[PDB]
Amino acid sequence: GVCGSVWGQNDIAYRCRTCENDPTCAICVPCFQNGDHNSHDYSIIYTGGGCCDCGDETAWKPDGFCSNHK
Amino acid sequence: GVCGSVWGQNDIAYRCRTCENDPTCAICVPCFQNGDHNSHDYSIIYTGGGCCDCGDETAWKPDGFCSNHK
Ligand SMILES: [Zn+2]
Ligand SMILES: [Zn+2]
Ligand SMILES: [Zn+2]
Numbered sequence: 001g002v003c004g005s006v007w008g009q010n011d012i013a014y015r016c017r018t019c020e021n022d023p024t025c026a027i028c029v030p031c032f033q034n035g036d037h038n039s040h041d042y043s044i045i046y047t048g049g050g051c052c053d054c055g056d057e058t059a060w061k062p063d064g065f066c067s068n069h070k
Numbered sequence: 071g072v073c074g075s076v077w078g079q080n081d082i083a084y085r086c087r088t089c090e091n092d093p094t095c096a097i098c099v100p101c102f103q104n105g106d107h108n109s110h111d112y113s114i115i116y117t118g119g120g121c122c123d124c125g126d127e128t129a130w131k132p133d134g135f136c137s138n139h140k
């Protein structure tokens with residue numbers, strides 16, 4: 001299932017335009033590192049805060065899920 | 071900041087088409103009840119799981135935030 005780690009106003013996370021369902025979706029750094037995005041169009045971003053969409057297939061492509069949320 | 075409560079495969083949450091940035095965004099039930107959506111086009115939904123977007127203005131309209139995440 002879904003990770004939902006929360007980052008805050010100034011914390012970084014990962015946007016991955018290849019896996020994302022929508023430009024608003026992001027995942028935490030550990031999820032990103034524990035997955036395979038090797039040729040994806042990803043970027044470090046500062047949203048003003050959010051909760052990790054890893055494990056949520058409406059928001060993110062399953063092959064973009066980390067090991068711990070398959 | 072952002073709530074990020076996680077619901078699971080069969081758990082309910084709230085979609086609110088008036089506050090939502092995108093059809094993929096949802097918030098947990100307590101956030102929804104602790105906010106004002108009185109004439110909004112909202113529905114109970116079963117995503118297969120997600121994390122609550124309440125408190126995240128890229129995902130959800132601030133006037134749609136609950137008391138505890140303003
Ligand atoms: Zn995560
Ligand atoms: Zn993950
Ligand atoms: Zn990716």
Ligand SMILES: [Zn+2]
Pocket residue numbers: 073074075097098099100101122123124
């Ligand atoms: Zn919530």
Ligand SMILES: [Zn+2]
Pocket residue numbers: 073100101102124125135136137138139
């Ligand atoms: Zn809330």
Ligand SMILES: [Zn+2]
Pocket residue numbers: 086087088089090106107110111112134
């Ligand atoms: Zn609403």
